[PDB]
Design an enzyme around this catalytic site. Structure first.
Site, PDB file in Angstrom:
ATOM      1  N   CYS A  34      -6.400  24.652   2.183  1.00 19.05           N
ATOM      2  CA  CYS A  34      -4.867  25.330   2.762  1.00 19.05           C
ATOM      3  C   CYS A  34      -4.891  26.664   2.200  1.00 19.05           C
ATOM      4  O   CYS A  34      -4.290  26.873   1.084  1.00 19.05           O
ATOM      5  CB  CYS A  34      -3.857  24.449   2.621  1.00 19.05           C
ATOM      6  SG  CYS A  34      -2.233  25.153   3.322  1.00 19.05           S
ATOM      7  N   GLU A  83      13.108 -12.176   1.261  1.00 23.34           N
ATOM      8  CA  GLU A  83      12.926 -12.206  -0.049  1.00 23.34           C
ATOM      9  C   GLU A  83      11.918 -13.082  -0.851  1.00 23.34           C
ATOM     10  O   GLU A  83      11.316 -13.790  -0.129  1.00 23.34           O
ATOM     11  CB  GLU A  83      14.555 -13.079  -0.694  1.00 23.34           C
ATOM     12  CG  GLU A  83      14.704 -12.856  -2.082  1.00 23.34           C
ATOM     13  CD  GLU A  83      14.438 -11.714  -3.061  1.00 23.34           C
ATOM     14  OE1 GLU A  83      13.676 -10.941  -2.671  1.00 23.34           O
ATOM     15  OE2 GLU A  83      15.651 -11.532  -3.822  1.00 23.34           O
ATOM     16  N   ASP A  89      -8.224  15.823 -12.232  1.00 27.58           N
ATOM     17  CA  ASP A  89      -7.314  16.914 -11.691  1.00 27.58           C
ATOM     18  C   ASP A  89      -7.682  18.328 -12.150  1.00 27.58           C
ATOM     19  O   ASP A  89      -6.977  18.725 -13.308  1.00 27.58           O
ATOM     20  CB  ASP A  89      -5.887  16.413 -11.880  1.00 27.58           C
ATOM     21  CG  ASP A  89      -4.831  17.481 -11.279  1.00 27.58           C
ATOM     22  OD1 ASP A  89      -5.346  18.276 -10.289  1.00 27.58           O
ATOM     23  OD2 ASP A  89      -3.708  17.467 -11.545  1.00 27.58           O
ATOM     24  N   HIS A 111      21.183  -6.646   1.668  1.00 24.45           N
ATOM     25  CA  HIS A 111      22.028  -7.174   2.556  1.00 24.45           C
ATOM     26  C   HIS A 111      23.627  -7.382   2.169  1.00 24.45           C
ATOM     27  O   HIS A 111      23.632  -7.343   0.794  1.00 24.45           O
ATOM     28  CB  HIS A 111      21.614  -8.423   3.074  1.00 24.45           C
ATOM     29  CG  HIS A 111      21.509  -9.409   1.823  1.00 24.45           C
ATOM     30  ND1 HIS A 111      22.673 -10.076   1.287  1.00 24.45           N
ATOM     31  CD2 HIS A 111      20.659  -9.498   0.950  1.00 24.45           C
ATOM     32  CE1 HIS A 111      22.186 -10.642   0.144  1.00 24.45           C
ATOM     33  NE2 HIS A 111      21.021 -10.206  -0.150  1.00 24.45           N
TER      34      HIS A 111
HETATM   35  C1  LIG Z   1       6.502  19.758  -4.963  1.00 26.34           C
HETATM   36  O1  LIG Z   1       5.529  20.568  -5.175  1.00 26.34           O
HETATM   37  C2  LIG Z   1       4.600  20.451  -4.127  1.00 26.34           C
HETATM   38  C3  LIG Z   1       3.199  21.364  -4.102  1.00 26.34           C
HETATM   39  C4  LIG Z   1       2.186  21.304  -3.354  1.00 26.34           C
HETATM   40  C5  LIG Z   1       2.333  20.289  -2.322  1.00 26.34           C
HETATM   41  N1  LIG Z   1       1.141  20.108  -1.392  1.00 26.34           N
HETATM   42  C6  LIG Z   1       1.030  18.966  -1.001  1.00 26.34           C
HETATM   43  C7  LIG Z   1      -0.122  19.207   0.063  1.00 26.34           C
HETATM   44  C8  LIG Z   1      -0.774  18.093   0.593  1.00 26.34           C
HETATM   45  C9  LIG Z   1      -2.189  17.918   0.699  1.00 26.34           C
HETATM   46  C10 LIG Z   1      -2.701  16.884   1.308  1.00 26.34           C
HETATM   47  C11 LIG Z   1      -1.859  15.811   1.817  1.00 26.34           C
HETATM   48  C12 LIG Z   1      -0.652  15.899   2.055  1.00 26.34           C
HETATM   49  C13 LIG Z   1       0.074  17.008   1.271  1.00 26.34           C
HETATM   50  C14 LIG Z   1      -0.679  20.290  -0.057  1.00 26.34           C
HETATM   51  C15 LIG Z   1      -1.550  21.443   0.541  1.00 26.34           C
HETATM   52  O2  LIG Z   1      -2.279  21.206   1.194  1.00 26.34           O
HETATM   53  N2  LIG Z   1      -1.326  22.876   0.064  1.00 26.34           N
HETATM   54  C16 LIG Z   1      -0.345  23.269  -0.588  1.00 26.34           C
HETATM   55  N3  LIG Z   1       0.471  22.369  -1.370  1.00 26.34           N
HETATM   56  C17 LIG Z   1       0.527  21.287  -1.110  1.00 26.34           C
HETATM   57  C18 LIG Z   1       3.551  19.514  -2.101  1.00 26.34           C
HETATM   58  C19 LIG Z   1       4.610  19.548  -3.224  1.00 26.34           C
HETATM   59  O1  LIG Z   2      15.463 -11.084  -9.062  1.00 33.94           O
HETATM   60  P1  LIG Z   2      14.945 -12.313 -10.006  1.00 33.94           P
HETATM   61  O2  LIG Z   2      16.236 -12.733 -10.882  1.00 33.94           O
HETATM   62  O3  LIG Z   2      14.050 -12.894 -10.310  1.00 33.94           O
HETATM   63  O4  LIG Z   2      15.601 -13.235  -8.482  1.00 33.94           O
HETATM   64  C1  LIG Z   2      15.669 -12.958  -7.344  1.00 33.94           C
HETATM   65  C2  LIG Z   2      16.555 -13.617  -6.649  1.00 33.94           C
HETATM   66  O5  LIG Z   2      17.845 -12.796  -6.483  1.00 33.94           O
HETATM   67  C3  LIG Z   2      18.307 -12.970  -5.084  1.00 33.94           C
HETATM   68  O6  LIG Z   2      18.131 -11.883  -4.375  1.00 33.94           O
HETATM   69  C4  LIG Z   2      19.729 -13.412  -5.227  1.00 33.94           C
HETATM   70  O7  LIG Z   2      20.248 -13.622  -6.777  1.00 33.94           O
HETATM   71  C5  LIG Z   2      17.631 -14.265  -4.501  1.00 33.94           C
HETATM   72  O8  LIG Z   2      17.354 -14.183  -3.271  1.00 33.94           O
HETATM   73  C6  LIG Z   2      16.322 -14.132  -5.402  1.00 33.94           C
HETATM   74  O9  LIG Z   2      15.652 -15.560  -5.537  1.00 33.94           O
END
Ligand SMILES: COc1ccc(-n2cc(-c3ccccc3)c3c(=O)[nH]cnc32)cc1
Ligand SMILES: O=P(O)(O)OC[C@H]1O[C@](O)(CO)[C@@H](O)[C@@H]1O
Ligand SMILES: COc1ccc(-n2cc(-c3ccccc3)c3c(=O)[nH]cnc32)cc1
Ligand SMILES: O=P(O)(O)OC[C@H]1O[C@](O)(CO)[C@@H](O)[C@@H]1O
Lengths: 439, 439
Positions: B148, B316, B118, B247
């Site tokens: 841009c 699930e 970066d 749910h």
């Molecule tokens: C929250 O701060 C941000 C700063 C910069 C961005 N952003 C994201 C993109 C962007 C580029 C490619 C794909 C999707 C978004 C972009 C840009 O093409 N030109 C200037 N800025 C940009 C978003 C949040």
């Molecule tokens: O998240 P854990 O404890 O690994 O287990 C997931 C379980 O939790 C539940 O959503 C309900 O406790 C079940 O559907 C599922 O088996």
């Protein structure tokens, strides 16, 4: 409130419809192919349609040339395509308009979701007319342009699928090639490529440059366009072979039991050795070997002495409550379930299990990876194999659960022209028959 | 031969390794960010890294500016970035080389698969040096350029995440904005955009033009680059809200039973009504409602009186043989299995069932669609919710199985800066507690 009922075949929870005494009962897309002749537009059209239909999106190709072959007598020469041919120019326009009429009928009256308009559509005027047609019918328009001027690629397309066209039956290979080159030249003056920089800035399009080496993507509107773009970016025309087979016969096969995670029988182990010899005899450059996470496919791959990759997505269809049961035991314990499956084998979902429909969704990443790769051996299961085969062989959802994929038999797939050449290789090892015909 | 054993935690069939008395024990990628400051390079870097790590590809960001903030004293002004600033130019080069040194250590010695470099990397000279570094270390290079020049988009980036930077603590909002504009101008003369037409024809790259309105894609080499490209094409910066909940309480919840397809309890039905009132009070333009194919999520959605879409991918986690059992019954019937899960909750696979690892692979299409969409309400299950939340909240595989997602509680996600603002809304309906802490 919140009363639901589970639909018998698909096992979907729906609101209990206590319909009164008098019960009462997203935008389609036109994919516009763009480009000079012999640019793989029909290859793209057919392949994309094959993929979209397989994933469950109703798609149909409307090739303007076929409407022309219907309207006109037997084809004589490139003279038909001349820009100074007043009569043929009228005929060709009429054919495009007749194809669009059938596009409207398909998308608005037949439940079609995607219409692939397979024509040159090389002028801005023709494309403006297609856009007008789409706007006034409330259809989305997505352009796919294939740009390739490499003479080797052009000549290869003419040799592989043009010279064999019904148009060139009375011509020999050399004069069909010569006529086709003249035919392309008829389109070159009027050709206005897509310009997403200035003129076509508001259009949703993909420019496929030099057989997918480069892409220009502009304004992708929805899910389906984004999927198409991803697919086009993963496919290639490099030579390759796809070998598909099931694991060697397992212990559950001998007992007539479905599902499970049983190991190879003595015959299954014999097939595994036979498969290694077969693989070796194929003398392949770099073969990728894929298996499921179930023991029987892994034991088969182990005999090859080659590196392999296990995919959970390749695991056999989940039979839910019916897992490890014989079909006789299914009929006797779950008779309603047995009859429902027999009647609707593709959409039928096993209780707490899967349908062939669920398999397709699971296998989508497998298909995308199969496209990217060159040589692959997939060691899998009966239902999984039927799905993959239906994709390559362009078989419908209705025919898919009944495709014949016997044990100890390799299906050698060679992509040629607009499909797959399928060669069967039985490795001379006995096994039980697990194929069950419809009723 | 062909003797296999099933690994205790993950349930993977491996060759029985009868290792003798003396047992013996694909190319990484450097993603190069390209572009002027305030072009969302860090936004892309962070988001892509978050996605890649979540799908199981070890990824790390190396931001050259952070190496600079470490080497240099507190930041004074844009004067540091001047092309005539001989000393700072040397320092900035040293910082880039130090980041690359850490890239080499990450990819070759720490098991990292993707290093996101970066920086501006605006000159061909800097990029030639990065390519040399990649070639001699046997790393692949993939370029991501963000183009841009819209002043609104530039000003928005400065206001949202630049002015809040540690560099601008002693500056006010107006002078940080003014300093940053001058800082961008320092880079504009030397900036050589990627040229896939002539100079960068052999480079693997993506040009993101005007916040993802248009894309130039050149020479995608492998699977991971193709996935990155697909992801970049699906993400957007349009304002939106993601509501995630389970749910309403079900009958199995009351009995302390796992899995199954039980219906809403009286309290669960009360939550469903409470959810409808909550949804209504949010006054959302167009809300998409997603459920699993299990009854309890569908009954909850039914109370909303809104259209909803059922996803089998939202079902699930499959507990295999342990389905519809209580945890007490699991400990007493399957004690080995219970202890194994407690020790390795992410990788643990239930017999004939799933792991949290399997869930991530299943939920990938859900995540891709969530990215594309603007407003969404996902009514799902405890383990499914933990996975989705770990993606949005950038939580590791190790922490994921323990994330707190109580019943009758909405998680309101607002994408802001380089993450998600998470707001919790309990809908004042009693339920049992299904959260289980580690041991
Ligand atoms: C929250 O701060 C941000 C700063 C910069 C961005 N952003 C994201 C993109 C962007 C580029 C490619 C794909 C999707 C978004 C972009 C840009 O093409 N030109 C200037 N800025 C940009 C978003 C949040
Ligand atoms: O998240 P854990 O404890 O690994 O287990 C997931 C379980 O939790 C539940 O959503 C309900 O406790 C079940 O559907 C599922 O088996
Ligand atoms: C079997 O007959 C074929 C005829 C044509 C093709 N084809 C496929 C592509 C192609 C285009 C985009 C992506 C992948 C392939 C292409 C082309 O860019 N230019 C000429 N031809 C082409 C393949 C088989
Ligand atoms: O293909 P059918 O008859 O629908 O059933 C698929 C079954 O075939 C098998 O591959 C073996 O008969 C089982 O694994 C699976 O349950």
């Amino acid at each position: 409130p919140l009363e639901l009922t589970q639909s018998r075949v698909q096992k979907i929870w729906v609101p209990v419809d206590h319909r009164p005494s008098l019960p009462r009962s997203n935008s389609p897309t036109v994919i516009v192919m763009v480009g000079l002749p012999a640019r793989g537009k029909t290859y793209i059209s057919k392949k994309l349609t094959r993929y979209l239909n397989w994933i469950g999106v109703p798609t149909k190709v409307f090739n303007v040339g076929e409407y022309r072959r219907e309207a006109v007598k037997q084809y004589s020469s490139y003279n038909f395509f001349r820009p100074d041919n007043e009569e043929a120019m009228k005929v060709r326009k009429q054919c495009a308009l007749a194809a669009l009429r059938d596009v409207k009928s398909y998308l608005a009256k037949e439940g079609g979701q995607i219409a692939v308009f397979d024509a040159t559509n090389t002028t801005r005027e023709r494309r403006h007319m297609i856009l007008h047609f789409a706007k006034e019918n409330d259809f989305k328009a997505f352009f796919i342009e294939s740009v390739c001027d490499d003479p080797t690629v052009v000549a290869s397309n003419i040799m592989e699928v043009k010279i064999s066209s019904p148009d060139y039956k009375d011509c020999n290979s050399a004069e069909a090639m010569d006529d086709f080159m003249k035919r392309i030249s008829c389109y070159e003056a009027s050709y206005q490529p897509l310009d997403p920089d200035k003129c076509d800035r508001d259009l949703s399009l993909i420019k496929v440059i030099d057989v997918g080496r480069r892409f220009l993507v502009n304004r992708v509107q929805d899910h389906i366009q984004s999927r198409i773009v991803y697919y086009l970016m993963n496919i290639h025309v490099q030579p390759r072979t796809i070998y598909l087979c099931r694991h060697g016969e397992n212990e559950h096969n001998l007992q007539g039991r479905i599902g499970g995670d049983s190991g190879l029988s003595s015959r299954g182990k014999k097939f595994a050795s036979a498969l290694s010899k077969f693989v070796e005899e194929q003398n392949l450059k770099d073969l990728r070997v894929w298996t499921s996470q179930l023991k029987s496919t892994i034991q088969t791959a182990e005999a090859l002495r080659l590196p392999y990759e296990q995919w959970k997505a390749l695991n056999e269809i989940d039979a839910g409550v019916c897992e490890e049961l014989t079909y006789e035991e299914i009929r006797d314990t779950y008779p309603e379930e047995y009859a429902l499956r027999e009647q609707d084998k593709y959409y039928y979902r096993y209780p707490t299990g899967e349908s062939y429909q669920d398999l397709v969704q699971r296998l989508e990443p497998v298909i995308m990876e199969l496209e990217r790769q060159e040589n692959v051996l997939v060691i899998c299961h009966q239902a999984v194999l039927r799905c993959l085969l239906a994709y390559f062989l362009d078989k419908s959802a209705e025919e898919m659960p009944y495709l014949k994929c016997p044990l100890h038999t390799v299906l050698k797939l060679t992509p040629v022209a607009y499909g797959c050449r399928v060669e069967s290789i039985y490795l001379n090892v006995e096994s039980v028959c697990t194929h069950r015909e419809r009723s």
